[PDB]
Design a protein around this ligand. Structure first.
Ligand SMILES: CC(C)CCC[C@@H](C)[C@H]1CC[C@H]2[C@@H]3CC=C4C[C@@H](OC(=O)CCC(=O)O)CC[C@]4(C)[C@H]3CC[C@]12C
Ligand SMILES: CC(C)CCC[C@@H](C)[C@H]1CC[C@H]2[C@@H]3CC=C4C[C@@H](OC(=O)CCC(=O)O)CC[C@]4(C)[C@H]3CC[C@]12C
Ligand SMILES: *SC[C@@H]1NC(=O)c2csc(n2)[C@H](C)NC(=O)c2csc(n2)[C@H](C)NC(=O)c2csc1n2
Ligand SMILES: Nc1ncnc2c1ncn2[C@@H]1O[C@H](COP(=O)(O)OP(=O)(O)OP(=O)(O)O)[C@@H](O)[C@H]1O
Ligand SMILES: Nc1ncnc2c1ncn2[C@@H]1O[C@H](COP(=O)(O)OP(=O)(O)OP(=O)(O)O)[C@@H](O)[C@H]1O
Ligand SMILES: [Mg+2]
Ligand SMILES: [Mg+2]
Length: 1181
């Protein structure tokens, strides 16, 4: 991985880098050549000659003729000087722009090569690795490359060109002294390389810690609903805090090593100064070198050293970029075993429907010890329907996944028409099969767009036909924005049944040759299920169909039914034979806005948030002023020492006394090293602590918000993660070492100004008359940068949304073969910041050229005015070139200040957004302690005429009116059609939303009056399609009560009560078995049962089951229901179910249509009053 960061540089990028390097070399060798022309070195001082020759220079007119010639030669410089500046105005641009143009073109291509690779890996790779980190790798990690292959390289080459040109000019004039000085540069190289490797290693680890924090944040934000229901905000915050603390610990060490690198560089530069003076004194003692010659070398080898000292940060940035490019290119270079982008494979023109499963042995990559399938055999002829039945966790979804070739069977072969599916092209194979997953997942787009994912070239007529066949037409057209209605992420703004019909339509619209249904009627009502099964029965002969069901009514008419037992199919035949066979199937059947742009002082408000670190800042600013004012003060000291050296007395004893002055240079080097390290370290550590607390506060505020805040289409999971990372990563770029260099530069300007006024006079006016133009350049830059910051942030959250949406839902994306579509969407999202980067590149080039050229112009104007003033005789020739050094350093510091305004402009907008998110208080405040906390509750729930509509489609009334009353130790059953609002009442009892009209009572007390945390802790909830975190089984069960430490014994009791303890015991690592993202490393039944155990371990007073047996075998349903019935006494229970067997025993059943409470009563009462309930019970008859 050495020197591979530029893998994606084409010919245009190569010429950009080459011409930029040449321009950088030209711009660097300017300073060596400004001295080489003024290297004639024999004009010396006529006045210095005058102290010796005052008797000779007593003549008034001949001393004037000298002064007048001095003008002539001085203007001779200011001419050349101006020309030099003109040249800079070209070459400076040509470097920065081009290097930036070479970086933006590669960073843009890296992101597309990264994401493509992410979409190229297979399902086993996603199962093994933690993919929640990938999102940060896309946003933060690649960003660290952008700052290390840009114009920083150009400025590095500029400084090294300055250094080496000065050393070569020095070699031509004074060779020995030059070798003695150059013998130190290997130490600089060794130090810089060692510090660079250390810094790169630390950056790798810091990026890893940030990726882990991002994975935690993404997992929490995707399951925020279960987080809020169980009150788990503090534990997620603590996990985030631990990752942030590790990242801060790494960042502090990074700051320490970078600052120690800079300090060591400066120390060794001053040591080189001392060595040069000592060798020069020795040489003039041996008389081998003319004193003139010694100043020729000194004045030619001693500025590129400070150039290298200034170039150290570019080395740091490149090291950080190399450290960041590790994981990105490791993922890029990976090659899938099952390649879905390969063009080499069989693509049969005619395909019938014969499936073959011979001797299928398979174990998942994550759990190799556990065997799932062992000798599986299955023959599926064409036009036939083969149903898969058995206990939950048997391996039916595994077989359906093997059909799509998401995994390679370990033993045996899966084949179509006698051809191994390995030989057939992966994309072609996955394109000819339609799939409905067990809990179907949609994307955060319109209904029509979601259906269009199944097949791209579908007309509205075909979409409508598929929707009609899927029994989804009525609710779609009942919605405003019929096919343009926005569904939430993971289709969470539709009901479970509606989402399932949308997925069925998506699978049907691609006219599959092989149809795969994974319990496609799990969330449907008996009437909806009957309609859907009839519709798929009408068109069945054209395509073979494999179906998995726990509702055996759909299986009743299947051509062939296969039963699972021990990873093999034990029974195989039609309904008649299997009932005659008296086997597992028989038992299963017989079982019974803009906000005022950006406010000023937002960045000031962030810094004021970092007020506990005031000693750090005061120490840093004292060190900054000291080491900033040293450089002009060191220039004055150098001038005085040179004046002593050139006019040294005849004894050699005092030449050694100036050699004693060389120790003052070592003292200055040591003190500069201390001050540089101190200021850098203090500012870096303060910035790190500010960044850590800033991300902590932003995430804490995010967890505080209402559910209505998460349903907002701008607040998606990917958008939230991108905002969380970026809003704090942009403040960091203007609060660390950059504020330190700002303070150093303002101190430098002040010191240079003070030196200018005292030593000479009237050249200070020039130094003040120039600052406004550099300020104007800064302003004209800052305007464009401020606009682009808002635009880039807004459109970067859009790309983060796409990336997270694709990564989290990768199995659906692969099943639908939509990797190319998501790459295209990602690129289209990336397009705008690309052009912003190009414009920003050219703007930086222009600004840099202007600042440097105006520096040279200021030098030329200084010499012009100095010559004109020497014509007035007001001030001597020593001060004119001293104030020249002062103006040089001060104006250059002011120019370097200007390269910061873009960062300040981004930091102020990020600061404003961070302040806005932190102070946002919700209507239903989770963190609020105020509110009623009853000492005991009777256990009564009353929905006394509740009228509610969701705050995403507020025109639609979801609960037009319904009155419910619940007594302690009773049981409500909630039945009805899909979309009737059964889940809505449970979400209201959870205080996820607040009803407009009506009210909800707990023991006759308004729910708003009670404390939200207490109310949520008094009740336990199981949702329609449960979400399990990517942790151990016991950790997921222990999530039931976060206000105490749940015992392992209690976890085992809860697991046993939920009919899951057997499976967990059978697993290696037992309850410590790690379940994957969203519980996808378990089956639907096991995940549901573990969710039941989680809601049971807390022993709630109010139990809220929401289709808690939706994905469960009838034998598992019976056991779970009888266990629930044992504890029905002394426990209020509310049950939402579409399978009516678990409902007959309930104390009372309420049938709701479209949000109304029309029918209620016991099972006998509802069965007697023939109507909706009687029709639902007797659908199959
Ligand atoms: C900021 C400081 C610390 C930079 C220190 C590292 C430099 C020595 C690097 C940075 C940019 C690099 C250049 C960027 C890209 C290329 C293209 C590269 O061409 C390739 O793609 C590889 C060779 C080939 O196959 O032709 C040749 C080296 C070169 C000029 C690199 C040479 C090494 C450079 C100058
Ligand atoms: C031929 C050289 C050794 C003569 C001495 C030249 C010097 C002026 C020094 C000062 C800074 C040095 C550079 C500091 C930074 C680096 C990066 C470092 O290599 C890496 O990039 C290491 C990997 C990483 O970045 O983590 C060592 C080489 C190089 C180009 C150094 C080369 C030698 C340089 C130019
Ligand atoms: S003029 C202010 C500063 N120079 C000195 O303080 C100084 C003391 S003694 C001395 N310079 C000897 C006489 N100078 C040289 O030998 C010499 C050769 S080339 C050269 N100076 C170039 C033209 N000087 C500078 O660039 C320069 C900037 S500030 C400065 N000297
Ligand atoms: N990605 C995975 N990694 C590891 N183990 C898995 C993975 N997916 C499933 N398993 C396990 O392998 C077994 C097969 O479960 P599978 O999903 O095939 O069941 P199923 O027949 O679809 O049942 P259900 O009716 O519960 O949906 C189960 O024990 C399950 O926990
Ligand atoms: N978060 C949401 N935002 C907007 N509308 C929603 C949201 N959740 C549900 N809806 C809509 O409100 C209505 C209420 O449906 P709800 O989910 O309450 O039904 P349900 O009885 O739980 O359904 P099922 O039995 O299919 O699970 C439906 O029309 C649904 O599309
Ligand atoms: Mg399954
Ligand atoms: Mg529901």
């Amino acid at each position: 991985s050495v020197l591979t960061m530029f893998r994606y540089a084409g010919w245009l990028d190569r010429l950009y880098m080459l011409v930029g390097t040449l321009a950088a070399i030209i711009h660097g060798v300017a300073l060596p050549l400004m001295m080489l022309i003024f290297g004639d070195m024999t004009d010396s001082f006529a006045s210095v000659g005058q102290v010796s020759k005052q008797s000779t220079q007593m003549s008034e007119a001949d001393k004037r003729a000298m002064f007048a010639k001095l003008e002539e030669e001085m203007t001779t410089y200011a001419y050349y000087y101006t020309g030099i500046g003109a040249g800079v105005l070209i070459v400076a641009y040509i470097q920065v722009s081009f290097w930036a143009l070479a970086a933006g073109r590669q960073i843009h291509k890296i992101r597309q090569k990264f994401f493509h690779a992410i979409m190229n890996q297979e399902i086993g790779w996603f199962d093994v690795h933690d993919v929640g980190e990938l999102n940060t790798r896309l946003t933060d990690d690649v960003s660290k490359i952008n700052e290390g292959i840009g114009d920083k390289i150009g400025m590095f080459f500029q400084a090294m060109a300055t250094f080496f040109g000065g050393f070569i000019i020095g070699f031509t004039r004074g060779w020995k002294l030059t070798l003695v000085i150059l013998a130190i540069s290997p130490v600089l190289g060794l130090s810089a390389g060692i510090w660079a490797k250390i810094l790169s290693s630390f950056t790798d680890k810091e990026l890893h810690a940030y990726a882990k924090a991002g994975a935690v944040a993404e997992e929490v934000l995707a399951a925020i609903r279960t987080v809020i229901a169980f009150g788990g905000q503090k534990k997620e915050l603590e996990r985030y805090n631990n990752n942030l603390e590790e990242a801060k610990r790494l960042g502090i060490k990074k700051a320490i090593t970078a600052n120690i690198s800079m300090g060591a560089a400066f120390l060794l530069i001053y040591a080189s100064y001392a060595l040069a003076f000592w060798y020069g004194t020795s040489l003039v003692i041996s008389k081998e070198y003319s004193i003139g010659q010694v100043l020729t070398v000194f004045f030619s080898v001693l500025i590129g050293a400070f150039s290298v000292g200034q170039a150290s940060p570019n080395i740091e940035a490149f090291a950080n970029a190399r450290g960041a490019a590790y994981e990105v290119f490791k993922i890029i270079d990976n090659k899938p075993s099952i390649d879905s982008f390969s063009k080499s494979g069989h693509k049969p023109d005619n395909i019938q429907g014969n499936l073959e499963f011979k001797n299928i042995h398979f174990s998942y990559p994550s759990r190799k010890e556990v065997q799932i399938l062992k000798g599986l055999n299955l023959k599926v002829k064409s036009g036939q329907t083969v149903a898969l039945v058995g206990n939950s966790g048997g391996g039916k979804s595994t077989t359906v996944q093997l059909m799509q070739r998401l995994y390679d069977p370990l033993d045996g072969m899966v084949s179509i028409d006698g051809q191994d599916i390995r030989t057939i092209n992966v994309r072609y194979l996955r394109e000819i099969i339609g799939v409905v997953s067990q809990e179907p997942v949609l994307f955060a787009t319109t209904i029509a767009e979601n259906i269009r994912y199944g097949r791209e070239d579908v007309t509205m007529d075909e979409i409508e036909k598929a929707v009609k066949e899927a029994n989804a037409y009525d609710f779609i057209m009942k919605l405003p924005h019929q096919f343009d209605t926005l569904v939430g992420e993971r289709g969470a703004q539709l009901s479970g049944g509606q989402k399932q019909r949308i997925a069925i339509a998506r699978a049907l619209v691609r006219n599959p040759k092989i149809l795969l249904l994974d319990e496609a009627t799990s969330a449907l009502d008996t009437e909806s299920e009957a309609v859907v099964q009839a519709a798929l029965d009408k068109a069945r002969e054209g395509r073979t169909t494999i179906v998995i069901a726990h509702r055996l009514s759909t299986v009743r008419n299947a051509d062939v039914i296969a039963g699972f037992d021990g990873g093999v199919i034990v029974e195989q035949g039609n309904h008649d034979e299997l009932m005659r066979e008296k086997g597992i199937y028989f038992k299963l059947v017989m079982t019974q806005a803009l906000d005022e742009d950006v406010p000023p002082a937002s960045f000031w408000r962030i810094l004021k948030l970092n007020s506990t670190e005031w000693p750090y800042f005061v120490v840093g600013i004292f060190a900054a002023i000291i080491n900033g004012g040293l450089q002009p003060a060191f220039s004055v000291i150098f001038s005085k020492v040179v004046g002593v050296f050139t006019n040294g007395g005849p004894p050699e004893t005092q030449r050694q006394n100036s050699n004693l002055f060389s120790l003052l240079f070592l003292i200055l080097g040591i003190i500069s090293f201390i001050t540089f390290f101190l200021q850098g370290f203090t500012f870096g550590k303060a910035g790190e602590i500010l960044t850590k607390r800033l991300r902590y506060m932003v995430f804490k505020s995010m967890l505080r918000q209402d559910v209505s805040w998460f349903d907002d289409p701008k607040n998606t999971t990917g958008a939230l993660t991108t905002r969380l990372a970026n809003d704090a990563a942009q403040v960091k770029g203007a609060t660390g070492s950059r504020l330190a260099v700002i303070f150093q530069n303002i101190a430098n300007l002040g010191t240079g100004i003070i030196i200018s006024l005292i030593y000479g006079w009237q050249l200070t006016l020039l130094l003040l008359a120039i600052v406004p133009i550099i300020a104007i350049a800064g302003v004209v830059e800052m305007k464009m940068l401020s606009g682009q910051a808002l635009k880039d942030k807004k459109e970067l959250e859009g790309s983060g949304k796409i990336a997270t949406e694709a990564i989290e839902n990768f199995r659906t994306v692969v099943s639908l073969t939509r990797e190319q579509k998501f790459e295209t969407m990602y690129a289209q999202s990336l397009q705008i910041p690309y052009r912003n980067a190009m414009k920003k590149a050219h703007v930086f080039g222009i600004t840099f050229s202007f600042t440097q050229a105006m520096m040279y112009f200021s030098y030329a104007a200084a010499f012009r005015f100095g010559a004109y003033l020497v014509t007035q005789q007001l001030m001597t020739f020593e001060n004119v070139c001293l104030v020249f050094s002062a103006i040089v350093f001060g104006a250059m510091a002011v120019g370097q200040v200007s390269s910061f305004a873009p960062d300040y402009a981004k930091a102020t907008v990020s600061a404003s957004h961070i302040i806005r998110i932190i102070e946002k208080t919700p209507e239903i405040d989770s963190y609020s302690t105020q509110g009623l906390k009853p000492n005991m509750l009777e256990g009564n729930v009353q929905f006394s005429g509740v009228v509610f509509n969701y705050p995403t489609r507020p025109s639609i009334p979801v609960l037009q009116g319904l009155s419910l009353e619940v007594k302690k130790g009773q049981t409500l059953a909630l039945v009805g059609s899909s979309g009737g609002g059964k889940s809505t009442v449970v979400q209201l009892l959870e205080r996820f939303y607040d009803p407009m009209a009506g009210s909800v009572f707990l023991d006759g007390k308004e729910i708003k009056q009670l404390n939200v945390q207490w109310l949520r802790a008094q009740l336990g909830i199981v949702s329609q399609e449960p979400i399990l975190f990517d942790r151990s089984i016991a950790e997921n069960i222990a999530y039931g009560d976060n206000s105490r430490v749940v015992s392992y014994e209690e976890i085992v009791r809860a697991a046993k009560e939920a009919n899951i303890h057997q499976f967990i015991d059978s697993l290696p690592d037992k309850y410590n078995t790690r379940v994957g993202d969203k519980g996808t490393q378990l089956s639907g039944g096991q995940k549901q049962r573990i969710a039941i155990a989680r809601a049971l371990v807390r022993q709630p007073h109010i139990l809220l089951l929401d289709e808690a047996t939706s994905a469960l075998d009838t034998e598992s349903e019976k056991v779970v229901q009888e266990a629930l019935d044992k504890a029905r006494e002394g426990r209020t229970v509310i049950v939402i179910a579409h399978r009516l067997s678990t409902i007959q025993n309930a104390d009372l059943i309420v049938v709701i249509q479209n949000g109304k409470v029309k029918e209620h009563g016991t099972h006998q009462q509802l069965l007697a009053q023939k109507g909706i309930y009687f029709s639902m019970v007797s659908v199959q008859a």
